[PDB]
Amino acid sequence: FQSMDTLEAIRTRRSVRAFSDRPVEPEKLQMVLEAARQAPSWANMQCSRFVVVQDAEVKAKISELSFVEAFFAPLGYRTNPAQKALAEAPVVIVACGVPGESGDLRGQQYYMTDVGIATENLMLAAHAVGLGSVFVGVFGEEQLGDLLDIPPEIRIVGLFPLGYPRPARKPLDEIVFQGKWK
Amino acid sequence: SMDTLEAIRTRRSVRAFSDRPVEPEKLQMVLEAARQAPSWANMQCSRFVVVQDAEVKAKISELSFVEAFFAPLGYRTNPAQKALAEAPVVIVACGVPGESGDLRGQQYYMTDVGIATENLMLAAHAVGLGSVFVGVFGEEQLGDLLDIPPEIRIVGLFPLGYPRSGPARKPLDEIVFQGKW
Numbered sequence: 490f491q492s493m494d495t496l497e498a499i500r501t502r503r504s505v506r507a508f509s510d511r512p513v514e515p516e517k518l519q520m521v522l523e524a525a526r527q528a529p530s531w532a533n534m535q536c537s538r539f540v541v542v543q544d545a546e547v548k549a550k551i552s553e554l555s556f557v558e559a560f561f562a563p564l565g566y567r568t569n570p571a572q573k574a575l576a577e578a579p580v581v582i583v584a585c586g587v588p589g590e591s592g593d594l595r596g597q598q599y600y601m602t603d604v605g606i607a608t609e610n611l612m613l614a615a616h617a618v619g620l621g622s623v624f625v626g627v628f629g630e631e632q633l634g635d636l637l638d639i640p641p642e643i644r645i646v647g648l649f650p651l652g653y654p655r656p657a658r659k660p661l662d663e664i665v666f667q668g669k670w671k
Numbered sequence: 672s673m674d675t676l677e678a679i680r681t682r683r684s685v686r687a688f689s690d691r692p693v694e695p696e697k698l699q700m701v702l703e704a705a706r707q708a709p710s711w712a713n714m715q716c717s718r719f720v721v722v723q724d725a726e727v728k729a730k731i732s733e734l735s736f737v738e739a740f741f742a743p744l745g746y747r748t749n750p751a752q753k754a755l756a757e758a759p760v761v762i763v764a765c766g767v768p769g770e771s772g773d774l775r776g777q778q779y780y781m782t783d784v785g786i787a788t789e790n791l792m793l794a795a796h797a798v799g800l801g802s803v804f805v806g807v808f809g810e811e812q813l814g815d816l817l818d819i820p821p822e823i824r825i826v827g828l829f830p831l832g833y834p835r836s837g838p839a840r841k842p843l844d845e846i847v848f849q850g851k852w
């Protein structure tokens with residue numbers, strides 16, 4: 490399939506924060522999630538998990554949870570410029586990690602690295618088929634988990650607005666959940 | 672190079688390398704790909720030491736052995752150990768933890784290096800090269816060997832070779848170091 494040259498995709502990929510309301514073809518959504526699934530992971534343990542969120546009301550709640558209060562502003566983000574994107578995008582993908590399914594040594598959380606690898610696949614694949622996304626790291630984790638029925642032992646790592654800009658792997662259905670955690 | 676989806680699908684962990692030299696141009700494309708990675712607040716905490724010296728690469732290989740007592744998840748032995756010695760190039764990927772998010776007790780520098788090294792690995796595969804993420808190594812001795820300060824964290828080793836409108840990035844000469852830190 491002809492998407493985009495790898496070097497070109499890597500160079501031209503941008504954080505997209507403004508989305509049209511044009512629907513994402515499930516065929517493209519599948520190519521994006523397949524790319525994430527194809528990611529290398531610590532010992533092929535594949536600790537990444539994804540919740541695909543499409544409901545308007547639920548997306549609006551997620552957007553609210555990604556607000557930055559100046560008092561609690563994390564490093565480098567005085568505001569969260571991707572906040573409205575989480576509301577506007579037809580699809581929001583919530584990327585999580587099972588920490589016990591990746592390396593834990595030298596005080597380092599390799600699940601964070603594994604999810605980074607998988608989400609860079611996800612973002613490059615999306616850009617390659619004409620979609621846009623942005624890694625969102627700022628959000629209230631406990632409220633988000635509560636909203637999506639994500640168990641507290643699962644760690645949420647990033648949110649990915651997805652839409653049109655304005656050695657065997659586990660089955661897709663084992664690492665991607667529709668609407669809420671299963 | 673190669674179609675993005677195809678490269679993502681066909682990329683493999685390569686652990687056996689030929690002795691064909693890596694063309695300077697390809698090495699640069701691979702490092703530039705890592706430089707182009709997105710990162711927490713564009714702070715770009717990733718750093719890279721490019722090692723080519725035969726003896727230093729042997730030492731790195733010597734350092735990526737698994738001690739039974741410290742055997743991490745799924746790696747009773749390190750299958751990529753010989754690769755570190757064989758490969759024409761080893762890229763040592765590091766992170767500056769203070770230059771990425773640290774909240775909810777999560778080390779986002781690990782995520783940022785993960786992102787940059789997936790660019791590196793995809794780019795490498797796209798131009799006909801092979802690589803493998805090596806997470807198993809003795810960080811202290813490796814840091815000493817390569818003059819890497821202990822406040823800098825080493826995240827991954829990358830044998831590299833042949834198989835047998837966004838915000839400004841930091842310049843390449845500030846994140847890529849030749850031979851040693």
Ligand SMILES: Cc1cc2nc3c(=O)[nH]c(=O)nc-3n(C[C@H](O)[C@H](O)[C@H](O)COP(=O)(O)O)c2cc1C
Nearest residue numbers: 529530531532533656683684750751804805806807
């Ligand atoms: C964070 C990370 C660390 C890794 N460390 C090692 C390692 O120390 N030794 C090794 O042989 N492979 C290592 N790998 C490679 C995995 O074993 C490999 O990616 C996985 O089994 C999937 O196979 P594939 O890359 O060919 O698709 C590592 C991979 C990741 C993502």
Ligand SMILES: Cc1cc2nc3c(=O)[nH]c(=O)nc-3n(C[C@H](O)[C@H](O)[C@H](O)COP(=O)(O)O)c2cc1C
Nearest residue numbers: 503504570571624625626627709710711712713837
């Ligand atoms: C780990 C991580 C967390 C991020 N969190 C946010 C975020 O919360 N809000 C936002 O607008 N962008 C976020 N970004 C996007 C970066 O700000 C962006 O990648 C960087 O500024 C470079 O821009 P570019 O992606 O267009 O090259 C995040 C990126 C990374 C890698």
